[PDB]
């Protein structure tokens, strides 16, 4: 289960996929909400979830994995990457990165990179 793959799937299919995972009344929800729910769900079942994008490092030192669809401009599905990850892995703006991710925790709004390229 990849965030980019879910993002490129038809809403109707995401709905069937989601309800087959115990989710309810997705038929009347926004595709973006359905994806996040499907991903948080799959995660709660003990499975790994993935994501990817082209890294953009911000002035302050943290970054986000941007997506071509959003035209590489800040989007709700951006993947957060810590200054520590950038530092330890010698990452740079422009790098194509893929990896396991986790839904946001209390206080966060975006999915976070769990392990880089792993």
Swiss-Prot record:
Superkingdom in the source lineage: Bacteria
Signal sequence bounds: none
Residue ranges of domain Rho RNA-BD in the record: 48-118
Region of interest called RNA-binding 1, as start-end residue ranges on this chain: 61-66, 78-80, 108-110
Similarity comment text for this entry: Belongs to the Rho family.
Subunit structure: Homohexamer. The homohexamer assembles into an open ring structure.
Known role: Facilitates transcription termination by a mechanism that involves Rho binding to the nascent RNA, activation of Rho's RNA-dependent ATPase activity, and release of the mRNA from the DNA template.
Record-given protein name: Transcription termination factor Rho
Provenance organism: Escherichia coli O157:H7
Gene encoding the protein: rho
